Amino acid sequence: IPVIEPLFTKVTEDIPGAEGPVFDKNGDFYIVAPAVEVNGKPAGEILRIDLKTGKKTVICKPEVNGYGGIPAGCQCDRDANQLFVADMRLGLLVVQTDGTFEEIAKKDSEGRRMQGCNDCAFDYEGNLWITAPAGEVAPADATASMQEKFGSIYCFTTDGQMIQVDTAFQFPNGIAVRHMNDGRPYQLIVAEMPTKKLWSYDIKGPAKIENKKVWGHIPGTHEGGADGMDFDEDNNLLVANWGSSHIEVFGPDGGQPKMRIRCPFEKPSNLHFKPQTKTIFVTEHENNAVWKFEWQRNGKKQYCETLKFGIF
Kindly tell me which residue out of 82, 127, 152, 173 binds Ca ion, with binding defined by CB under 5 A: 173
Nearest to 283 by CA among 298, 265, 259, 299: 265
Choices 30-38, 115-123, 139-147, 207-215 (CB under 5 A): range interacting with Ca ion: 115-123
Does 230 bind Ca ion (CB under 5 A)? Our answer is yes
- Of residues 10 through 39, those in contact with Ca ion by CB under 5 A are none
285 is catalytic: yes
CA angle 179, 225, 263 (to 5 degrees): 85
| In the complex, residue closest to Ca ion by CB | 272
Give the residue with the Cβ less far from Ca ion, 119 or 166.
Answer: 119
* Residue 270 annotated as binding site: no
Choices 112-120, 183-191, 242-250, 287-295 (CB under 5 A): range interacting with Ca ion: 112-120
Kindly tell me which residue out of 63, 108, 119, 232 binds Ca ion, with binding defined by CB under 5 A: 119
Cβ distance 163 to 182 under 8 Å?
A: no
Nearest to 92 by CA among 46, 44, 154: 154
Strand partners, 96: 82, 100
Choices 58-66, 87-95, 113-121, 205-213 (CB under 5 A): range interacting with Ca ion: 113-121
* Residue 230 annotated as binding site: yes
Q: In what order do the strands lie in the sheet with 3-4?
A: 3-4, 259-262, 246-250, 237-242, 225-231
Rounded to 10 degrees, the C-alpha dihedral 205/77/111/67 comes to 150
Task: List, by residue number, the catalytic residues.
Answer: 285
- List residues forming the annotated binding site for Ca(2+): 19, 118, 173, 227, 230, 271-272
